[PDB]
Design a binder for this molecule. Structure first.
Ligand SMILES: [K+]
Lengths: 249, 49, 52
RNA sequence: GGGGCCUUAGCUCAGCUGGGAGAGCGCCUGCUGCAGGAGGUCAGCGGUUCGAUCCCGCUAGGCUCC
RNA sequence: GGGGCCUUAGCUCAGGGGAGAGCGCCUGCUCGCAGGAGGUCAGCGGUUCGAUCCCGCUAGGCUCCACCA
RNA sequence: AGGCCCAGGCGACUGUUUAGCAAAAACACAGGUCUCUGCGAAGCCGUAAGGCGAAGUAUAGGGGCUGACGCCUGCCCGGUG
RNA sequence: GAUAUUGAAUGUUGGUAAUUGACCUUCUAACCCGCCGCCCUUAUCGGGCGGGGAGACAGUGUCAGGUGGGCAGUUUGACUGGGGCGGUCGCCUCCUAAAAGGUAACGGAGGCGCCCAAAGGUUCCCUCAGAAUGGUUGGAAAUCAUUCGCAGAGUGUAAAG
């Protein structure tokens, strides 16, 4: 009841369900695997669960959408308890190209919910996707086209997964509106519109406060400029602006 | 920057000599052949660790 | 039909009045019928019926 | 009291520091917004000189200034 | 009056090593591209191997003081 | 045994105040609001016992600010509480 | 908050070899009642007795941390053409400084709070600035070569010597 204040009002929905997962693992003494919780929902769950222990794995290390195991003080989990299936996306690579937008659009097009798949990995040699094992056969059967490319899915082990723009700058403050303006190369008044409407996120939390102070190692997500990361804050200049470093995706 | 140091007779262990070096210029333990008045002869005296 | 700063679709009306001396080009919001700006301003002192 | 600056058309001020009295606004005219009108001893008075708001003489008045 | 701070390209700001970056403005190309435009680095005189970034002064703009009889 | 009138500032008003240089525009005020307080109330005095609060009980009691009445009382929760 | 006053049980979870911890709930008998009845007793005190409530909590003691101008003791520099404000406070060099030395002012100018493992020691050897004249790049100015050349250079760094 006195947890919601710490999160947003829309985020209440997840928090209610996150409390219902903790309820199970305490009383029934059994691990609860979840449906690839979003990077934000990782942060929320971590809080709602409390310290019921928690584990998280999205197949490869550095998956955005990862599935969480809520386990007690015993039954420390394995890599396959997360019920993850990796696939290699086969297509006529010489003729057609698959991009992240097309493959994401195709996954959604076959009716797959965002919670039923993790990250879509693009390397030089392979395009791979990670899904929940319960949906693996459905996705393999239905995902026959991505954009203009005819595609097929080959099952692989997680071990077979084939896993910047540094921009040293100065800002007046570490307010959100100031950092966005700097990163996105805009007027601050324009950046304030972005923040206020609800287009910027900070670690996948929608921050609508222009004056929110941004810390070192915060993934900002300006809808319109993509995504960028305050990696370094490096003291202050002669004329008193924060020496900073940005790295766009 | 430049720091205080002790040299110590590598024989008898007698902390015989303070001095100064620049650490950036001289980052590894300096040694010199300076008289130990315990031993009563020149010995190598190395910067104390 | 244009987009706003957030990316939402907005419709603007551009009125081009050919009235000699009083000719004007006026941009409005289509939803609110509110003048964004006009190439020539018309104060209430100049015209009691309509302000631009 | 002492210094300082201006007085100009209906109104308000330009005009180089003599080179030949103007603008804006208002007003009067016709047109359909336009041009075109009027209007001054350039505060007044009298020297300079080829012409003087213009140069100086010579008095108003108001401001600047302690 | 005194102190304290400021003066960089159109605009916003980076920056003892020979003055940049974005945006605007121009180049051709149709939400990104592709090269330009533009600087007495307030000024001055000097420290020196070179000064936007030393140092001393002059501007100007802000800021804080100018009290006690 | 009242001088009166016109106009303006301040305070609504009657009250109160620097005994002995200040009576006021200062205080109070009725009204407003905020806040604490479930009763061995909070608050306060006292080391405590014992008290006030109250022989009261949230329409009550304490504290802060505001000050009749009329119209009203905007923006800012980063800082501090 | 720990600990004493402070007990009994039931669970559950530690750690030692069945005892001792931790926490949850329950209990009543300590403790508490500014509740009721009865008595001491003509008594809104107090005490006793019996109910009831609450209960090992609270309260109180010791110890600990936090908060704490509510209160207490204090501190809050000197120079200074009055004090405040500004500036300054130790060290080095020069000038003032009156041809020994010393010498004041909120007198005139600058430095310092290091640096260097060689920029120290010694041995041997050497001579600098700049200019003229000639030179592919190459220019006033890089690199040669020639002549001239008390130093017009250099001496880690301020200045003087
Ligand atoms: K004096």
């Amino acid at each position: 009841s006195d947890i919601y204040q710490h999160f947003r009002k829309d985020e209440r929905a997840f928090i209610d369900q996150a409390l219902e997962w903790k309820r199970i693992v305490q009383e029934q003494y059994r691990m609860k695997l979840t449906d690839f919780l979003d990077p934000r929902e990782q942060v929320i769950l971590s809080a709602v669960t409390g310290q019921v222990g928690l584990a998280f794995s999205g197949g490869y290390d550095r998956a955005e959408r990862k599935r969480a195991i809520l386990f007690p003080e015993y039954i420390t989990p394995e890599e396959s308890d997360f019920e993850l299936q990796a696939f290699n996306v086969r297509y006529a690579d010489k003729f057609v190209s698959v991009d992240h937008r097309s493959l994401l659009g195709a996954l959604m097009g076959i009716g797959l919910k965002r919670q039923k798949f993790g990250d879509i990995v693009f390397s030089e040699t392979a395009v791979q996707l990670i899904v929940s094992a319960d949906t693996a056969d459905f996705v393999a059967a239905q995902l026959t086209q991505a954009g203009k490319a005819a595609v097929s899915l080959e099952k692989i082990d997680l071990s077979d997964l084939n896993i910047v723009e540094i921009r040293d700058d100065t800002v007046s403050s570490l307010r959100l509106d100031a950092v966005c303006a700097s990163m996105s190369r805009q007027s601050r008044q324009k950046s304030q519109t972005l923040v206020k409407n609800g287009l910027v996120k900070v670690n996948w939390k929608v921050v609508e406060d222009p004056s929110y102070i941004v810390a070192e190692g915060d993934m900002l997500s300006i809808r319109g400029f993509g995504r960028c990361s305050l990696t370094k804050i490096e003291g202050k200049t002669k004329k008193d602006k924060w020496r900073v470093t940005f790295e766009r995706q | 920057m430049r720091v205080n140091i002790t040299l110590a007779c590598t024989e008898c262990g007698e902390r015989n000599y303070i001095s100064k070096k620049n650490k950036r210029n001289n980052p590894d333990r300096v040694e010199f052949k300076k008289y130990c008045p315990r031993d009563k002869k020149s010995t190598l005296h190395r910067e104390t660790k | 039909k244009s987009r706003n700063e957030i990316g939402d679709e907005t419709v603007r009306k551009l009125y081009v009045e050919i009235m000699g001396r009083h000719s004007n080009i006026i941009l409005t919001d289509a939803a609110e019928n509110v003048i964004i700006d006009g190439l020539k301003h018309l104060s209430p002192s100049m015209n009691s019926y309509r302000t631009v």
